[PDB]
Every structure is written in C-alpha cells, then in structure tokens.
C-alpha cells in the first residue's frame with residue numbers, strides 16, 4: 542500500500558485516487574481501467590454512490606466501492622517511524638512560528654523527558670519539566686507533574702509547550718498537540734499553516750493563503766517553497782489522519798508571521 546493510501550481516504554489527492562485504482566487492479570486481478578476513470582480527490586470519491594461506481598467502471602466499480610467501504614471500516618496502520626518524523630516536523634514548524642510571532646522570552650517545555658529543544662536556534666530561555674525525566678537528562682529537567690489545579694498560577698511568563706503531554710487542563714499561554722474538550726477551554730484550535738524564512742529559489746504552481754513565505758506576498762510561490770509546502774502538508778496530514786490535534790493560545794495570529802517579511 543503506497544504511503545498516501547494509508548491515510549484516511551478523505552485526505553487522498555486526485556493522484557492518490559489514481560494510484561489506488563492501480564493498486565486495486567493488481568491486488569484483485571481486475572480489468573485495467575483508465576487512470577482518469579475517477580478524476581477527483583478522495584473527498585469527492587466518498588460522495589459517489591455505488592451506482593456511480595458501477596457506471597464509471599462496469600467491470601470493476603462494485604468491487605472498488607466495496608474495497609473503499611472496507612478501507613473506511615478498517616483503517617490501515619500507519620508507520621510509527623514516519624509518524625514520529627511527521628510529528629517532529631510539525632512540532633518544529635509550529636513552535637518556531639510561535640516564537641517568531643510573539644517573541645516569548647521563556648518557553649516552559651512540560652512533558653519533555655529528554656531535554657531536547659524542538660527549535661534549538663530560537664533566541665529564548667528554554668526550560669524543561671517532566672514527571673519522569675530520563676535519568677541521563679534529569680540533571681537539567683525539573684521533576685514535576687503538571688496539574689492545572691496546582692500550577693495554574695505558575696509558568697505565566699513566556700509560553701508553555703505541551704507536546705503530547707496530556708494534562709487535566711492547559712494554561713492559556715500554551716502550545717499543544719494531543720492524541721485522541723474541557724482540557725482545551727483556555728485555548729483555540731490551531732489551523733493549518735506553513736511558514737518559512739529560508740531563501741527563495743526558482744530551479745505545478747501553488748495557490749494557497751496558508752503558504753506564509755516571502756514569495757507568497759505577491760502570490761507567486763517559488764519552486765523551492767512550493768516543494769517544501771507540499772512536503773509539510775503531507776507530514777501534517779499524516780499526523781491529523783492518525784488522530785492528533787493541535788491547539789494554541791488564543792492570541793496566536795498568522796499576520797504576525799507575515800510581518801516578519803520586510804520591504805528592503
């Protein structure tokens with residue numbers, strides 16, 4: 542199963558649907574169908590009726606429809622290493638952006654047992670906390686079990702990071718990833734964005750309001766950032782498809798990221 546097909550079908554692109562047809566043809570010895578028989582993405586494919594499938598593919602449509610129902614009832618397991626890398630990719634993107642946007646002087650990293658910074662180049666005082674620190678890193682980790690009822694009046698400077706540290710309730714100045722609502726009342730959902738300050742380079746166009754790059758100030762994303770945006774979106778989809786959700790302090794504002802780009 543190609544990697545994209547391990548995502549829930551709602552995340553499948555038009556090219557993913559076409560690769561699904563080819564996989565299904567070989568796995569089930571079906572009559573070859575033109576790759577454009579289902580010229581749509583997975584969101585659209587889920588809207589078709591079984592009749593629609595039969596009309597589009599008289600020879601294999603019913604089978605394809607049932608295959609889709611089985612995939613929907615029994616999601617495929619994702620790869621732990623790819624999901625690890627995806628989550629780390631998102632973590633670095635989101636925390637890097639938050640620090641650039643709001644210039645927090647301190648980050649309180651709660652639930653980090655290894656004392657590894659996700660954004661090592663940030664100009665910020667990084668502080669680590671964990672209820673069970675790794676013995677080889679405890680010398681620089683505060684042994685602490687966070688509970689809102691006990692600590693809501695602490696860590697009010699800077700920003701708190703809870704990256705899969707599933708506490709009872711998060712304080713208002715937090716960045717959160719949680720694997721699957723009262724825990725989140727002080728926060729808002731974090732919508733998808735991509736931010737990059739790497740140099741633009743020119744050697745399918747990308748149209749998207751969520752590509753926060755110097756070259757998208759004028760709507761003409763460079764090839765380099767187009768590529769990096771699509772790779773980042775793939776990581777983000779793999780993480781959301783696997784059941785993680787991202788939450789953030791309510792003042793988080795992507796226009797603060799657009800303002801990092803200046804006109805000289």
Ligand SMILES: CC(C)N(CCCNC(=O)Nc1ccc(C(C)(C)C)cc1)C[C@H]1O[C@@H](n2cc(Br)c3c(N)ncnc32)[C@H](O)[C@@H]1O
Pocket residue numbers: 619621624651652653654670671672673674685686687688704705706707708709720783784
């Ligand atoms: C960050 C990490 C170390 N640990 C991850 C736990 C959750 N794991 C998880 O959600 N993993 C996962 C989810 C889904 C998948 C797939 C296969 C479905 C994709 C795979 C893995 C948590 C770290 O945080 C520390 N911890 C936990 C609590 Br709760 C806590 C606390 N209250 N105060 C301080 N430290 C705390 C703990 O002591 C501990 O250090």
Ligand SMILES: [Zn+2]
Pocket residue numbers: 740741742754755756757762763764765766
């Ligand atoms: Zn660019």
